[PDB]
Amino acid sequence: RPRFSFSIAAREGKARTGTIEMKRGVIRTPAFMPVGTAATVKALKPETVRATGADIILGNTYHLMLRPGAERIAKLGGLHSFMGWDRPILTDSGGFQVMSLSSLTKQSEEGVTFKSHLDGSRHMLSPERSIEIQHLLGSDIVMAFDECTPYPATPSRAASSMERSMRWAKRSRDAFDSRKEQAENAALFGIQQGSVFENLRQQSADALAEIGFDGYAVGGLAVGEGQDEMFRVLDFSVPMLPDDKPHYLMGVGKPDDIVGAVERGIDMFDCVLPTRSGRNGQAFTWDGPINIRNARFSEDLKPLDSECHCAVCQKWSRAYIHHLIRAGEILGAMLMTEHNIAFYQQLMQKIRDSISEGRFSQFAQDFRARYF
C-alpha cells in the first residue's frame, strides 16, 4: 500500500465514507479509534481490540514519554512491536495533556517545560521534540504539536494561541519532513484552532492549507462548550478544511456527538468514553447507556444489548457482569470494555453503510429516536 492515500467512496450531504490506505493497513472512514493510553487499550489484548473491528488505535505521547519513555520504546523496537498491535497507530502531540495533566508548566514560543504528574521529574516538549518522540514511537499518523486554548476564550487569547499554533504547525511540518524515514513512511496531520470564532477558524484553516498536511484535525472542541455550540462551530469550520483530506475531530466520542459530527463532515474520532465508562459500569446499548450496577440487572439473563454481536453479548448475561463490576473483578472491566468498544465500532459500521447506501439521514433519525 502507499504511505498515505485517502479516497472517498460515497457522500450524503456533508457526510463522507471511504478509506485511508497506509503501509500498516486500511482504515475505513468514518472511523473510531480506541485509546491506548500507556501502550495498552485498557483491559484488552490487541487481538481483542482488532476483533471489535478497530482499524487503528490512538497512542498518548504525553503518557508514553513519561513511561516507559520514548527512547526506551524505540530501543525495544517501537510501539507496535512493544504492545503487539501491527496496524496503524495515530499518536497525539502530547500538548493537550501537558496543559491538563502536568504541573508547573512553563510556556514559551520555543515550547513548554513541565513536571510529570507521576513524580517530580522535569520534561520538555516542543514542535521538534514532539515530532521526534512520535518518530521514536514509530507512529503512522503524526499530529502537529500545538498550544491549546481553554474554554471559554477571549478573541484576543484565541487569536494568539491559534497564531502560535500555526507557527508551530510549520515547525512540525519541517521537523517531520527533515526526518527521511518518517516523511517517507508516516503521515502528518495539522490541527485547526480558533476556538468558537469563525474568522480565526478561517485563518487557521488557510494557514494549515498553505503549509499542507495529509489530514486536518479540528481542535479546541469537546472541552466544555456543549454539543449545541460544538455543532455550530463544526457547521462553519469543517467546510474550511480541504475536502479531499481526512477531517479528524479530537476527543469527541459519545454516540450522538459522533453521528452529528459525521453529518457535518468529520471522518475520524477518538475518545476515552468507551473504555473509561466501561470500567465504571456504563454499558452502551441502542436504547441508550445503562448502569450495569443498578439492582434491576441483578437477575437479568439478557446480554448487555439485544442486538450487539460482540463476544460478550454472545456469552455472558447482564446479571453476571453486574456481579463482576460490583465485586470489583478485573473480568468485569474486561467484558464491559470489550462490549463498549465493539458497540462503538458497530456504530461506525452502521454509519459507513448508511452513507454508502444514501440513507444516512434516516439512520441518524432512527438512531436518536431509539437512543433517547
Return the one option of a copy of itself, Zn ion, none that residue 313 interacts with (CB less than 5 to 8 A, by type). Answer: Zn ion
Give the list of residues 6+ apart from residue 163 with CB closer than 8 angstroms, or none.
none
In angstroms, the CA 186 to CA 4 distance is: 8
Active site residue 92: yes
Residue of 191, 308, 336, 355 interacting with Zn ion (CB under 5 A)? 308
Binding of a copy of itself by 296 (CB under 8 A) = no
Per-residue binding string, a copy of itself, 49-88, x by CB under 8 A, is ------------------xx---x--xxx----xxx----
Give residues with Cβ within 8 angstroms of 203, minimum separation 6: 162, 166, 194
Candidate segments 19-27, 41-49, 181-189, 243-251, binder of a copy of itself by CB under 8 A:
41-49
Among 220, 246, 100, smallest CA distance to 165 is for: 220
Q: b/e string for 135-146 if b means 16 or more Cβ within 10 A?
A: bbbbbbbbbbbb
Work out whether 98 is an interface residue with Zn ion (CB under 5 A): no
The binder of 310, among Zn ion, a copy of itself, none, by C-beta within 5 to 8 A per type, is Zn ion
- C-alpha cell at position 339: 462490549
Tell me: does residue 283 bind Zn ion (CB under 5 A): no
* 327 near a copy of itself, judged by CB under 8 A: yes
Residues 334-363 that bind Zn ion (CB under 5 A): 339
C-alpha to C-alpha distances, 130 to 60, 112, 137, 154, 192, nearest whole angstrom: 11, 11, 11, 27, 17
Calpha distance 13→253 (Å, rounded): 21
User: CB-wise, 1 or 75, nearer to a copy of itself?
Assistant: 75
Question: Is 324 one of the binding residues for a copy of itself (CB under 8 A)?
Answer: yes
Closest CA to 73 of 3, 138, 16, 117: 138
Residue 330 binds a copy of itself (CB under 8 A): yes
Q: Is 86 a catalytic residue?
A: no
8 Å CB contact between 253 and 271: yes
- The binder of a copy of itself chosen from 5, 199, 280, 301 (CB under 8 A): 301
Q: Which partner from the list a copy of itself, Zn ion, none does 176 bind, CB cut-off 5 to 8 Å by kind?
A: none
Residue 179 is placed in which grid cell?
Answer: 526526518
Judged by CB under 8 A, the stretch of 8-16, 189-197, 239-247, 298-306 that binds a copy of itself is 298-306
When binding is defined by CB under 5 A, the residue of 310, 325, 341, 351 that contacts Zn ion is 310
Among 23, 45, 50, 164, binds a copy of itself (CB under 8 A): 45
Residues ≥6 apart with Cβ < 8 Å to 10: 16, 17, 18, 355, 356, 358
Which of a copy of itself, Zn ion, none binds 68 (CB below 5-8 Å, type-dependent)?
Answer: a copy of itself
What sign results for the dihedral spanned by CA atoms 339, 343, 349, 353?
Answer: positive
Q: Just list the catalytic residues.
A: 92, 270
Q: Which residues bind Zn ion (CB under 5 A)?
A: 308, 310, 312-313, 339
